[PDB]
């Protein structure tokens, strides 16, 4: 019925489902010691024992009980009800996690504080891993026309200061439901993705007072910002333009219908119970044009290309960045990839020169360092060592760790090894790398220009690109929060850099798993170079690229700044060329035709 | 139809009241009643009224008052009522070039003229919305059923998509406005019935398209999920069901789901389709590759003298002749006086060099009035030849003096819905016929649909026109491309060409360069070979904010970009004269300069 049956919204919903049935399988807490007597007396009120199953099932984060049914398929606590199939299942997590900035998130258990609950890996698990493993558990079971219900925060699209550990895994259940609807609907199972809104009470009020005290703004700033966002006015206790926040009664009212037969039509339905809100649920901008790269001037800057295992595109991306006449430091996650990349880069065509326009440049040779977000202290020491070697680090392209995740696209019948590799190494790994970058930005001296961190995604796998999909969707909210919450910190008296001056961060994420051409690699790197080396600020988080090689506009840019400078010079002027079939004449005719004139080649 | 029957059947009980209203042909209640009362329940709750077909504001208000007062039996008291907007007609099934503008063109399939087709279930819905302004009890609800094809490319039903669209924009504006009182409008998408009529209709469409049988239905059976239980396993794509969507919609209308306001009711069983095909301008286009030497651009202008003349200047800067047609009278002479001045009477290209391009002609066009616009189209044909580039601007600058939608009582919105939506549809066919009646082998046909600018209080009407345009462009582009290969229509004269249209929304940017950015985007999608795969285009909320570029015809400085990059230069006496200009162009090139004087 409801995963969060222990002191959770679902534990409250247990008061329902009894008028037309009975509330059963109320999952208990992890401790399971005081949970046996917890809410047992409350549940016994106005409800006979009957077959109501209030067993304190262990909501384990890891899959040690995944094979175990515990009222799923067979066995059970005391009755054979696991043999029966329950028509509903809820993927609620109910773990807020730590509430801190991007400099001091508790990555390891030694870094935890009493205000903190769990660690970074635990925090990511408590919101993604339980969802995924409970989805896999008892997959062939449940009725042929059952229902699957999710619950996520409505802040998964709105900015949320100091809650990256909350939203970064909370921006992943929606993506996973999106990717799983297509591959699950076959058997005839729907995924009702319903988001109950914040409940109006004194707790959220005090939360917001603490919130705007932390950000450093006058009282009621966040309250005004989230009240003006409201477009509808409630009719509770009549009145006019009350504009009260959403109530849990409406949450129960919109949740109970999933058990009824009327829900059979819905599938993949965004069902945000927040009433009358306008947010751009998805932020994107398909590239209409092809960027001009001969106005970047990235010289005098260091670009740490944090590549995990996909160094194949990295070496080329590093060379393209070198073409901007910029020094680069290529960082590697896997150990053996370092040797292969060194061998590949030693050969010319990768370490040749900083070839830009129609001319070369020495610039600096591409360095080679080993990094790993799994170990915090080693990665921080390596970053400090790079600081001592060169100085500050501002431009940092961030690529995922492993290339082409998993051998198969299926996400139902899979062993947990690859899935647990995807978590704790791509989500947690990238969050850890962002943590180290933010530590370097804050606790170490930097400049005044804004800080750029691109988040290029995995390429096309000729299949369902869900493994790049989760990466993109979990990166979107992360970069959005990192962008918005790092502006108040640059002016507040709390964080004045110990009297020094610093800058905020602006971070997009390119998406290239939608094109399937051969020039898409040059296209993405071009966009990467333009977003790093130039001055520009796009207000959209995610950036999408066209569905064709050239897409809307047909341009190829093989270092042809001259042909770009010669555009439209002699427009609409017929030209006659004698002997223009070999030598200087052919070249003059070709450059004139590229200019725009009309040419008549005679030989 | 069937969904209305099921809704009325569910009304028979559960503490509900049934009202079979909205009679057709001004008298249909007698033809459609007394069958709901045939059930044991509701001995008197069954109510039928012979309301006017057009349902103007005053007659709608009278009908509402007589319903509140009942059939003289109950005390007069306004209360809740049925506000579902399911009442409507399909309209003509005419093809992409032929259209019933005048009533004389009535056909057995086309029982309604263009204006009547537009008002079938759009104008009447808006008028009923206005007539339900004064007294709607708190906690009520109202929906506007739209078709699921309001985003999917269609064929032969431009009159069932262009007016069937913009209901979303009207609902958006009404949700923003009327939400203060505590009322809601949510778009609802009941799917096609799994009946034999819809099955044979698909077969007819396949035959009409000139394609092998089954591919049109394959487009629905391929990119649509199943996620159903019917027939136990192996539930093949059978399209959504009407009874389920009707029952769920009326359950939303009842309690247990109050104040949802998070429902689009897009019941297509998956069917991944964007809610709006659009992109953002994160870069400024480079107008250097634009070429229109041998091309004629006719600007379908209106009373907007300033904007149309600016567009004419920015297109004539691409060495092209123009024909500026103005919709309303008494504006031709002002345009002539303004254009007489040398500011707009001289054409200079993007480098700042004057060009001896043909001057700006001036004609008079009357979209809403057929047989005269076509005559003028043929006249300008005889004058110049075929015309392919048609920038279509709206009728009036500000569609209403007050930025509101429900306070009015059908006085100016009639002019809007009759001369700026229908007007556009009439002009679109006027142009389509010129292109198809006279086939011309060339590139695809380009029809931009620039929207009006923003001054204050946003642009609710612009939103409406945008929603109607996106679909008109989408459905058209599809039909055109499909009909470019059919030998049936190919034999008419010579070989023709397809059409590719777009939109260039501007009502979101409020700056000083939004009337120059718009000129750049109109001149880039016409004078170049760039096929946007997305329908609606949108300006950035901040021009200098995302990409600040200033282009007063300065293509030289654009050509001199990144030449001497990362070099330090020392200049002597570089404060005024030749050396100052060398320093200026070198700094624009990318080098580092050190001015000393």
Residue numbers in the entry:
A (entry chain B): 13 to 615
B (entry chain A): 19 to 615
Kindly provide excerpts from the paper associated with this entry:
It catalyzes the two-step reduction of malonyl-CoA to 3-hydroxypropionate (3-HP), a key reaction in the autotrophic CO2 fixation cycles of Chloroflexaceae green non-sulfur bacteria and the archaea Crenarchaeota. Full-length RfxMCR was a homodimer of two cross-interlocked subunits, each containing four tandemly arranged short-chain dehydrogenase/reductase (SDR) domains.
For the first time, we here determined the cryo-electron microscopy (EM) structure of the full-length MCR from Roseiflexus castenholzii (RfxMCR), which shares 58% sequence identity with CfxMCR, at 3.35 Å resolution. To investigate the dimer structure, RfxMCR was imaged on a 300 kV Titan Krios cryo-EM with a K3 Summit direct electron detector (Gatan) in counting mode. From 4,647 micrographs, 4,043,667 particles were selected and used to construct an electron potential map with an average resolution of 3.35 Å. The ED (Gly783–Arg932), which comprised eight α-helices, was inserted into the SDR3 domains (Gly573–Glu782 and Met933–Gly962) and was exposed at the two sides of the homodimer. In the center of the homodimer, two of these α-helices were anti-parallel arranged in the reverse direction. Instead, it plays an important role in connecting the RfxMCR-N and RfxMCR-C fragments and also serves as a point of intersection for the two subunits to form a dimer.
